[PDB]
Amino acid sequence: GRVIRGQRKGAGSVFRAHVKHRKGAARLRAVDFAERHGYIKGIVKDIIHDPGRGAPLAKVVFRDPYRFKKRTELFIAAEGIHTGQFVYCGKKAQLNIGNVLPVGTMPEGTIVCCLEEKPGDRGKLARASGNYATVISHNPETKKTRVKLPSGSKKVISSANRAVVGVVAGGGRIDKPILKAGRAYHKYKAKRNCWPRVRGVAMNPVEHPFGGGNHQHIGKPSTIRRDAPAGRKVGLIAARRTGRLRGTKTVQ
RNA sequence: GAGGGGCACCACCGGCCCGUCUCGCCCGCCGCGCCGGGGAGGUGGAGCACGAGCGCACGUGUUAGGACCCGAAAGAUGGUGAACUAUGCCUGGGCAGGGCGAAGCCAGAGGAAACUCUGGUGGAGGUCCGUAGCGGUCCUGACGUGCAAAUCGGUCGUCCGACCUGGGUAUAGGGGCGAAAGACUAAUCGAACCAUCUAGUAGCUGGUUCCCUCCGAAGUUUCCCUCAGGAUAGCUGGCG
RNA sequence: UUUAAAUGGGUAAGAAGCCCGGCUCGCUGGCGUGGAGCCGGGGUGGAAUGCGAGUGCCUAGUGGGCCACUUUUGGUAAGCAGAACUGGCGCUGCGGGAUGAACCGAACGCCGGGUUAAGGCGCCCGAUGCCGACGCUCAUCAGACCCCAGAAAAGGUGUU
RNA sequence: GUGGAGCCGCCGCAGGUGCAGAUCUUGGUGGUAGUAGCAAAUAUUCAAACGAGAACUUUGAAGGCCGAAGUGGAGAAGGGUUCCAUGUGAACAGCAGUUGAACAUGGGUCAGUCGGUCCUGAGAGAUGGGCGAGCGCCGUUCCGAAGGGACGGGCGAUGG
RNA sequence: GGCGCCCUGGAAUGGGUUCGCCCCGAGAGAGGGGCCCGUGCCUUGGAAAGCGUCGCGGUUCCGGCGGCGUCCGGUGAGCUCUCGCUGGCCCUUGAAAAUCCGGGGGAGAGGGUGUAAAUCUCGCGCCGGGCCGUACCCAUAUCCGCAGCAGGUCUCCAAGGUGAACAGCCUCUGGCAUGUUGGAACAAUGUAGGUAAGGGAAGUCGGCAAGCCGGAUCCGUAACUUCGGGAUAAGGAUUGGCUCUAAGGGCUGGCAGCCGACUUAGAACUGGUGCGGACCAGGGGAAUCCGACUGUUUAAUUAAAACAAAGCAUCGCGAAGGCCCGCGGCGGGUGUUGACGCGAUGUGAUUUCUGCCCAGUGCUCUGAAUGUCAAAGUGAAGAAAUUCAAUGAAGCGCGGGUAAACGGCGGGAGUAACUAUGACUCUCUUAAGGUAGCCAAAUGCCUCGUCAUCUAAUUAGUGACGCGCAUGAAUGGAUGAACGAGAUUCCCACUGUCCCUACCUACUAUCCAGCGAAACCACAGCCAAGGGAACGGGCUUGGCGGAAUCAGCGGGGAAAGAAGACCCUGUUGAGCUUGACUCUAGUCUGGCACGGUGAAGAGACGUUUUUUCACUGACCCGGUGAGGCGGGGGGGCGAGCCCGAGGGGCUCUCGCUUCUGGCGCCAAGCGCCCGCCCGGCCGGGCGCGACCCGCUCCGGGGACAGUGCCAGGUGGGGAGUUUGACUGGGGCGGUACACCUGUCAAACGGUAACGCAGGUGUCCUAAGGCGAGCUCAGGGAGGACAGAAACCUCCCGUGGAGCAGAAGGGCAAAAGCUCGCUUGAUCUUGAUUUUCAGUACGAAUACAGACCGUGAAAGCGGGGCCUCACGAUCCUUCUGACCUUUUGGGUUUUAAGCAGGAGGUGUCAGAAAAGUUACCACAGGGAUAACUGGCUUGUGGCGGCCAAGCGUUCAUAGCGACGUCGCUUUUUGAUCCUUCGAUGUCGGCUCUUCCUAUCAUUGUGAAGCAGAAUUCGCCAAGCGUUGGAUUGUUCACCCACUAAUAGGGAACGUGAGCUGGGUUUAGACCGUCGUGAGACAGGUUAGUUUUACCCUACUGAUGAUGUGUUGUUGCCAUGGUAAUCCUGCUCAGUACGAGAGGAACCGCAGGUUCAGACAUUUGGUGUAUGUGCUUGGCUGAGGAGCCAAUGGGGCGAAGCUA
Ligand SMILES: [Mg+2]
Ligand SMILES: [Mg+2]
């Protein structure tokens, strides 16, 4: 009769994110006349750190084309960049590390981070620490290019989508063990109120579909349908298969 | 002695009206018909057979209403609470002394070399002993109409850490929050508290207030989701 | 089960009966047959005992019962479970059974005299304080009054 | 006998119509009973003074405790006059009280520079807009003609 | 003090440096500067004030008057605070704004000169600064807890000694009156603190509780190991006081001379072997089970093995997405996000492994493969309502995948040269048959398994074994260091836990002065038996019965607390669960709308359907301060291109920013035009620089998504409700729940029980109807095969056969067999019977009016030879009349009626219905279980009577079959009387009494009694009937001692006497069971045990009545009563006896248990606080003392005491 734990994460009372000491959205600068037709020069000032993100950031000062003003962007730091480096951003930008330029002009098989899934959306895909995407298959008629996401799933996107050349810094992070319960606590204190996950088998029949019984057992099959209602989707939600995995994934 | 007329009422026979049923023939014409009416028998009706009702008052019985009085566990509607406590977040404050001695470093010694050994230095750790703090194992100690609607005395757990804590702030009742004990949410929690619906319902417990006179029971029948209850016949009293 | 009680159950013991003559009928049919109904007429003393009866309306409470002879079912048995007939208790005091729900007598307005019932009469405690009758019995565990509240098989050259 | 201003009989009428009980309701009073009790944190003593009156007030003297993570010195929240003086001893302080945070009368809190005031934090909340039968809610940059100001530069009027 | 500041100059034989590091050709060292903090000192303030001290005036303001002083040094791992310098740790990076300031730019502005402007963050001077808070407490008395409440409640400041220390103990500054009272006494019982001879767990469920060990220095340390640990392992040695010695630093001079720190080591002397002297402070070892650890957890009964955790897996998702919120919006959260991410689960570090199953239940994927399946739409028939038909969404069904999804892992056959088992082979159920491992496990019923080992003795522990009721692999299996306020077993050490208690101390209790309640209370308060609601205080019969009281005490008041939490009932609830009943949010699909423009393709019959592409304008999503969009031309250094002459433009290109941590705006210039200069000077204006036109701001989707509405899926996520009755309590079982036969049943009828013996929910077109002819079961005697049984014949044959089935009744030219016809098993109205209320249904009887059958006819027949074989209202369906009504009147369809058949209610006079609760709640019930008590005694026990036997012989010394009669209430039942507004439920411990059915002790009788020893009876309950191991045990079983180790009762004596082990709440684990919540006298673990001050009883203490008062000395009525058992020597190795063996009485020495006392002796105790020893502190030191809640410790009188 009582609501379950994942149902209470949608109201967002204590399950809202911890966003105070974060710096801002890490977004490419918006497209205008300079990047549709040419390039523009910017210099990165400092490599900073977000709490709760695994990647670092790069704050880059550009020269405003229309007002006399220097205005600061925040980029996802591509790996290998340093402070006091010139960063070039445009259609006619030259393909180096850290330069951001449209995916339709760059060749096939170049490694891409922080790319747009619809044009002008200022960077959505392939942004976690150490991740990247690969471009193949330019279709210069009905201009669409297909990329390869970090999940191995390919996606045909628009050609004028914009993207910084390189891989996201801070990679190899998940190779280290958390190694004790204390350093997992500090990990999620930067992120959310989510960390000590009680098993639903351990709680009571008000609190979960799996709890109860004189023995800790699930009882009911732990693969459930996708059109199950809220408060019943717990466990392996619309699982195509179970058991320890064989092969690679063998389902497109 | 006998005879006669017989009230009311009771029993019986006969008749009458309405519905139906069988059997049968006749009659009438604001128009001759897939019309109207009648007969003789048997049956169904809360009927007729020279009317008794109405209004008013009182008494008894039963029913619907708070319904002889008091009593739930509930359900619903609309509100008030995070001054305790649960968890986030904001901004502050707090934690003696010792023990072990990681990485780094320095010298010396062995050795043909590869390298090894030794002594320092160094001070790491959800590291150990252990104050303040935070807890609350054992005595199954004291207290148990207590100092106290949970306290005390030893003893004990942990004290750089998932640490302890103040004020600010957020989340609210089939909701919240929960390192999960159905824990905690103002001494209230396997669904809070306030007011209303509400005098909710009870075949179930308790109670039910003056005197004398007369009569005086039953615990059995049949039916019931009936078995601690009713209805029905018996038993009773009252009126005639 | 041939036979077959006791106890028991129905019915009859009159005028609403008995008899005679006549009329109706569409029933019955050799028949003025049969049977029903109907009218008129003739004569009342028809077992014992006891009692005044008939009928209608309204109607409360009750719908857990229990007990004892007798007869019975289940049970080793039960102050057990379940029936039959009658009485009682519940609703009921009183005399007695010391005691008591139900045993035995007897049912009850308020009192005086008398007499009894069941039970009794050494003393509690009313009444044997009779010159009561005949026998039986000795217990180092005597006996002592329906229900009823304690005993059996077996044995004694104990006594009759 | 107390009491000090109303009351009753009869014939009809009408009821919030008579108590011993409901772990009844409210109020009062017992017995228990001058009883249980006034036992956590080492401790009091002598003299004096004022007074009707002193184990407890004050003052001196001795002896002790706390022992600087204090029984010491100041604050925050909270309280609200509890602070201070004099008077009082009815009640209250669970013995007493000549004492008090009690009662009675009268005093006391002074700021440019101590804080509030100001700023924003998590967050809270209008307007535009949206939703909604509606009280209203969502929402905080989102679907908004969201600047009322100006170093300036010039015209036009207008004034010392 | 700091500097990641400068200049000179260049370093290697590398140097400078720190406690550590670190720094250097990107400039070290060295030399000379610069800057920042200066909270320190000097000075102004400022000595005039402050304080200390010595005076002197002033009665009263006096912030009186005056003298002198307020001075030199040292030191430090010191404490506290501040400033700084450098490191480390982070999958953790540790706030915003208000304000304030520097810098860059240079639009402007300024006096224009032999004088002063604009300006000034410089030095002084003037004016103003409103509003509100401001006392005090801040806590064992100002706050919260009902209060002056051992509780709670945020901070800062903090001295001397001892010492590692903000420890403990002692003192100074500053506080206080011992915590809401004083006095006297020093009994019990308590609470808190000690101590104890000898023994050392013998106590106990358990070593619970207490005690040991404890600091530091010097040695010395194992198994095991994840190599880090363990580890303060373990095990030793030492420690004082006093003298000394040796070592450990600073600064001044040209290697020496003057001052400072408390450490370390070594030796001597010394004391009654005493030294961490108080204080502070690790008991250790060997093992097993569980959890890796640290963490966390039910505030107020559980701290754990639970939860969490790192690690390991699996799952969903590329944003119009996934998972959630929301009454609502394209509203919110994850998301200031983007697969190294978010969301959803499970297992639980490491190491080592992860077996076999896709049948089931889920989950998931697919081909115009196909079964089923809604609205809308399509077609047909009809006058229409309406009806039918075909087509076919998702889902289901079918097929595939998936077990680190829920989960499951059994049998049965054959098979090896003793037997056994089965490597092997073959199959069933149901897909597979439990692999590696592991085990009587926290998982094994039987079971206290068997076997080793530990003990004198072990239901314990450990190690094995393993067809294992019911082990098993992320339900995770097995190991394994470290760590557990976890569970358990042993060993050492230690001890009053125990033998077995004793004594001392504080605080009480006790008495007094003051002050003073509450629970509770029908009336009350001495018993034995009887009866009684079966356990009286009162009642009956007995015993008996003096005031008034005090300190105790726990037998009784079935003592108080509470309308039993168990159990049952209720047509009372609630929490959860699901393959319950009924729905619901949500979501997946189809339709119609919003919803437009075009093209192409396809399926079926111009008609209809469907698909894919293109468009954009609705609609939607991004982005932006809606900042350059689309077409068109300006420019060749680029193409000079189809050809080629000076060039032409089928086809064309874009542009001006890319070695570097710099700057970039507010227009230059050119052309025109005005007022201003007489063909020249000021101040303004416009354009080109900066192309033109145009209808979305730019991109991305787009007639889809989305939304409104309806139809169908799915939907315990959520809501509502339900969960039969009877019942020797309930459940399970059964159906005695509707019905029929025989009996019970007691000779009319009626009659109960979960009484007995059975039966029914059908069967039958003949097994209904009628007529005719016939005789059955069985037997005898004959007949080819032919027999017990074949068919044929004759005789006998009263029902011994048959009649559909259960019984009972009935029946012979029959009610049975065979045959011939038939449909009366049809239509219709009443009455009667049965059950019964004298209602209904069902069944039946007698008719009547029809139409029929059969028979020659009489007749018989409206179901079955009779007794059973079945079913309301409402609804539905069919039939019946040339019927009645269909609402203003007609016609027609339909609908409603009337009449009677059917489609059901078996809980059968008829609801529509799954669990669980140990998290539980209410109303009740002793109408009703679990406990005692009561009736009963089957059963358990203990006895007799008879005598076939046994006993060499010999029934009865001792036994005794086949029987048979009893007792007892210590067994277990049976029953259900008392108790449900409560009688506290096992065992042990402690303690008193009682019984006898006698184990021992006294006196005896009988043996198959030689003696010794046994055995069986008698009077007899006087007196005894132990110490232990395992176990919660009662019970058991074993070791040992003994005269003997007999059995019982007292509300299964005894919880205001205890304990809490067991059982029996709530947490948790395992096994089996269930889909699940949950269940299991199956196992394991952790789990609040309240009150006497009342009345009596008992125990002690005053006293009361009576004697005139009072005293001394006495008597005894009555009541209590207490002693017991063994051993040794003697008798004696004698009697007796073949021997072996082997008595007793008298006497004598002790002892055991028990009872009464006592302190000479010896132990304990000890606060004579007696005496000296001693640690830290304190009084200036000595001397003498004091404090440390009794500072410790050695001896100790008296007194108590074994
Ligand atoms: Mg978890
Ligand atoms: Mg009689």
- Give A91-158 as a 3 state SS string: CCCCCCCCCEEECCCCCCCCEEEEECCCCCCCCCECCCCCCCEEEEEEECCCCEEEEECCCCCEEEEE
Between CA A198 and CA A180 the distance in angstroms is 18
Between CA A184 and CA A196 the distance in angstroms is 9
Between CA A44 and CA A80 the distance in angstroms is 13
Which candidate, A98, A96, A53, places its Cα nearest to that of A77? A98
Between CA A86 and CA A84 the distance in angstroms is 7
The CA–C1' separation of A183 and B96, in angstroms, is 29
Rg (CA), chain A: 23
Provide, for chain A, the percentages of residues in helix, strand and coil under a 3-state DSSP scheme, each rounded to the nearest 5.
10, 25, 65
Tell me the two tokens of residue A168.
């996201």
| A67 Cβ nearer than 7 Å to chain D strand | no
Query: Cβ of A167: how many Cβ atoms within 10 Å?
Result: 20
Pairing of β A154-158 and β A223-224: unpaired
Between CA A217 and CA A201 the distance in angstroms is 7
Resolution of the experimental structure, in angstroms? 3.1
Distances (CA, A) of A215 to A4, A204, A222: 21, 12, 16
Instruction: Calculate how far, in angstroms, residue A196's C-alpha sits from the geometric centre of ligand 1.
Output: 7
The experimental technique used to determine this model is cryo-EM
The CA–C1' separation of A153 and E484, in angstroms, is 50
Minimum CA–C1' distance nucleotide for A188: E92
Tell me the two tokens of residue A60.
């880059």
| A20 Cβ nearer than 7 Å to chain D strand | yes
Between CA A31 and CA A71 the distance in angstroms is 15
Q: Detail the DSSP E strand segments found in A22-96.
A: 39-49, 56-63, 70-76, 86-90
Residues with CB under 5 A from ligand 1 (ion): A 197, 199
Tell me the two tokens of residue A143.
């201009």
Task: State residue A34 phi and psi, 5-degree precision.
Answer: -70, -40
Distances (CA, A) of A167 to A100, A115, A152: 12, 11, 16
Burial of A207 (0-12, 13-18, 19+ CB in 10 A): middle
Cβ atoms of A77 and A83 within 8 Å: the answer is no
Pairing of β A56-63 and β A70-76: antiparallel
Which candidate, A141, A34, A140, places its Cα nearest to that of A92? A34
Minimum CA–C1' distance nucleotide for A2: B174
Query: Cβ of A71: how many Cβ atoms within 10 Å?
Result: 12
| A21 Cβ nearer than 7 Å to chain B strand | yes
Helix (H, G, I), strand (E, B) or coil at A86: strand
Minimum CA–C1' distance nucleotide for A12: E333
The CA–C1' separation of A146 and C139, in angstroms, is 131
Task: Give strand E nucleotides closer than 7 A to any protein Cβ.
Answer: 90-95, 293-294, 306-311, 313-320, 322-326, 332-348, 354, 358, 361-365, 401-407, 475-476, 575-578, 585-588, 614, 621-625, 627-629, 655-658, 660-662, 664-665, 698-701, 713-719, 1069-1080
Between CA A78 and CA A128 the distance in angstroms is 11
Q: How many helices (H) and strands (E) does chain A have?
A: 2, 12
Is the backbone of residue A137 left (phi > 0), alpha (psi -120 to 50) or beta?
A: left
Distances (CA, A) of A250 to A152, A226, A238, A241, A247: 12, 21, 17, 11, 7
CA A189 distance to own-chain centroid: 19
